[PDB]
Every structure is written in structure tokens, then in C-alpha cells.
């Protein structure tokens, strides 16, 4: 939380996409469209 | 003559030899004890502070 420490090599936020839950919201919403 | 007048300010300093008057017995004084403290001791000199 400092302006000089912006691009830390290990930041506090880590992306986590759970791929089985993502495929089902694709396939349901591609069924409706 | 240009379109404007102007005013000018100097200073001047004067030596003076004053007459300080001091009435009797106003300020009481308190005289302590002098201490001595060494500082900056070299191979060439030993200096003190009183």
C-alpha cells in the first residue's frame, strides 16, 4: 500500500479462476442466447 | 520627464554613546561554582572548558 512499492514481484492479489465453474456459466448462457 | 514621479527612501546609521542609568539594588544575582571539563585532547594539546 505504497506508491513506490507498486509492481511488487509477489503482490497481495492472486488471480484464481475455477475452470469447472466457468464452463457451466458459458454453456448455460450460450444456450439462452 | 517620464510620466510618473517617484519617492525615495534611504537609511542611515549613527554611532551613539549612551548613558545607561540603573537604579539601586534592583536585580539580585546568584553566583555558582565554576567547573572544568576537558575536550579535544590530542598528542599535541590538552584543551579545557571552564
Amino acid at each position: 500500500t505504497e506508491a513506490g512499492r507498486f509492481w511488487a514481484p509477489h503482490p497481495e492479489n492472486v488471480l484464481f479462476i475455477h475452470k469447472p465453474t466457468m464452463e457451466e456459466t458459458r454453456r448455460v448462457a450460450l444456450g439462452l442466447r | 520627464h517620464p510620466g510618473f514621479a517617484m519617492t525615495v527612501v534611504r537609511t542611515d546609521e549613527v554611532l551613539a554613546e549612551h548613558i545607561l542609568y540603573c537604579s539601586r539594588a534592583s536585580t539580585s544575582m546568584f553566583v555558582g561554582l565554576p567547573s572544568v571539563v576537558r575536550r579535544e585532547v590530542r598528542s599535541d594539546a590538552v584543551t579545557f572548558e571552564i
Partner: protein, 300 residues
């Protein structure tokens, strides 16, 4: 409670001419090869290592000054000189009689450097004993790390002009090297280009680095790929030149590369310390009219 005094005797009496030059510098810093009070003449200068018959050295003097004991003149009596001893963290007084004259200020850090300038500015020849005492070049640390650097660049381009004329202009080289700006003031140093054999050893070392360093860092980057690589080393791949990254390391074999990497590091620690670590002493008081600086010596 301890007694420190260093009294050097001689074999023959001094001349009347040579006594006036030592009275000119009655406060000084001499190196001195022994710690005991009674001692012969052959150590108290730089004549023990540096001489006219031997080839002049930089590094073998800078190796020597860190190994040597310093001393300060008190009184010059014929023939027995009278120094005083320099102790670790000891407070004493220095007068600054050195040629050429660099202006001292208080709260500066004095660095004893070897004399790389002319002979008559540096030494005082004793004709009675036939031995040369050499006063070291005491220069403030930021000048001493800059009066070396521009003269070491001057020695490089003098070696390029002697090999090929069209690569270097003399007016470009003289204007940007012999004039040294420090503390607002300028100093035009004596070039002595009349024939700088002092700095040939450093000009050999810094060039042999300069070829082997970019050859060396390519192998040391690729040989450290890990899961536990330090995260700052990802940054410095953007610093290395793109021509450096295109080396075919197939050209040099394994029995050649171990010879390089041991030559790689062995110059690096030998060249790092000789820029860093010398006998270096602080100054906390100074007056330009008396030319008297009070100092205290830090041994490193």
C-alpha cells in the same frame, strides 16, 4: 600511559640544503615499515618498494600502504629524525605541505594515495645517504576517487593514439581529463606527457575485465535457472545489452570456460579492494591561514 615516539638515526650528517626542505614540511604523514622506535632509513618513505631502477607501480604501492604503519614528523634534527606514532583512533594534528596543493576543508575524509605525479613534487632526495624518501599523496577521498579516474581514462586514450592516430583528438582528451572540478573549484593537474607508467597495471586490469565481463555474465545467468531464483534477477535481464545476449558459448569449451571464470573472479576481488581500502583518516577542524588540520586516524 603508553609511550609512542619513533626516532630514526642516520649514518652520515645532512647537508645544509636538504634541511630546509624538511623544515618546509614539519607536519606530514609518512609511511613507515616497522612499529618499533629505533629504525634504519630504508623504510620510512616509499623507496622500499618504488624506485627509479625498478619499474613504477600503482598496485604494489597500494598493497603496501594498507600493510604499513603511518607516522607524523615532529622535529627535524641533524641527523636524527623525530617522528611520532600513529595509533588506531588517535587524535593528532596535521599540517598540509604537499605538492601540488589541494585545498582541505574540515569535515572531509583524508585518503592516503600513492604519488602518481612528478618526482620533484613528490620526493625529497637525501644525497648524504643516497636514499630517496617519498612523501605520499594525501588528497580528499572524493577527489582521490576522481583524480584517479580521469587520469586512468587519459592513460587509455594515450594508448589508443599511439596505436592509431585517427581515433582520438588531443584537444578533446586534454580539455576533459586534466581539468578537475571539485567543491566549486578547478585544478589543472600536471599531465607529465613529456615522454604515466604508474597506471599501466590498472589499464591492463580494467580492460581484461571489460572483455570477459559480458562473456561471463551470459553463462552465469543461464546456469542459475530455478524455481527459487531471486526475484531481482528477472529485472536485470533488461539492463544487459542485446549484443551480449547473442553469444554462442559453443565456441569456448569446458576446459576453456573454467579458466575464464577463475580469471573472472580473481581480478574482481583484487581490483575491488585496491579502489576501496586504504589508510584513511578524518578531519574535524581546519584553518587555512595556519594550514593546520586536526585529525583522527581510522585503520581499515
Amino acid at each position: 600511559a603508553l609511550d609512542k615516539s619513533i626516532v630514526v638515526n642516520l649514518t652520515s650528517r645532512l647537508f645544509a640544503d636538504e634541511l630546509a626542505a624538511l623544515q618546509s614540511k614539519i607536519g606530514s604523514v609518512l609511511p613507515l615499515g616497522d612499529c618499533h622506535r629505533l629504525q634504519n632509513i630504508q623504510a620510512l618513505g616509499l623507496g622500499c618498494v618504488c624506485s627509479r631502477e625498478t619499474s613504477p607501480d600503482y598496485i604494489q604501492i597500494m598493497q603496501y600502504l594498507s600493510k604499513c604503519t603511518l607516522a607524523v614528523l615532529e622535529e627535524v634534527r641533524p641527523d636524527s629524525l623525530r617522528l611520532t606514532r600513529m595509533d588506531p583512533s588517535d587524535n593528532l594534528q596535521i599540517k598540509n605541505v604537499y605538492a601540488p596543493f589541494f585545498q582541505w576543508d574540515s569535515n572531509t575524509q583524508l585518503a592516503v594515495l600513492p604519488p602518481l605525479f612528478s618526482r620533484k613534487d613528490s620526493t625529497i632526495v637525501l644525497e648524504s645517504n643516497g636514499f630517496d624518501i617519498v612523501f605520499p599523496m594525501v588528497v580528499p577521498q572524493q577527489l582521490g576517487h576522481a583524480i584517479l579516474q580521469q587520469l586512468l581514462v587519459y592513460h587509455i586514450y594515450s594508448k589508443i593514439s599511439a596505436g592509431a592516430p585517427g581515433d582520438v583528438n588531443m584537444a578533446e582528451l586534454d580539455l576533459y581529463t586534466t581539468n578537475v572540478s571539485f567543491m566549486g573549484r578547478t585544478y589543472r593537474l600536471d599531465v607529465d606527457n613529456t615522454d604515466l607508467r604508474v597506471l599501466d597495471d590498472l589499464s591492463m586490469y580494467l580492460c581484461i575485465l571489460s572483455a570477459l565481463v559480458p562473456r561471463g555474465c551470459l553463462r552465469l545467468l543461464t546456469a542459475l535457472v530455478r524455481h527459487d531464483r531471486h526475484p531481482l534477477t528477472e529485472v536485470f535481464e533488461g539492463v544487459v545489452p542485446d549484443e551480449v545476449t547473442r553469444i554462442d558459448l559453443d565456441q569456448l569449451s569446458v576446459p576453456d570456460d573454467i579458466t575464464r571464470m577463475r580469471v573472472m573472479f580473481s581480478y574482481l576481488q583484487s581490483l575491488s579492494s585496491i579502489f576501496n581500502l586504504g589508510p584513511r583518516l578524518h578531519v574535524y577542524a581546519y584553518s587555512a591561514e595556519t594550514l593546520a588540520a586536526s585529525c583522527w586516524y581510522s585503520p581499515r
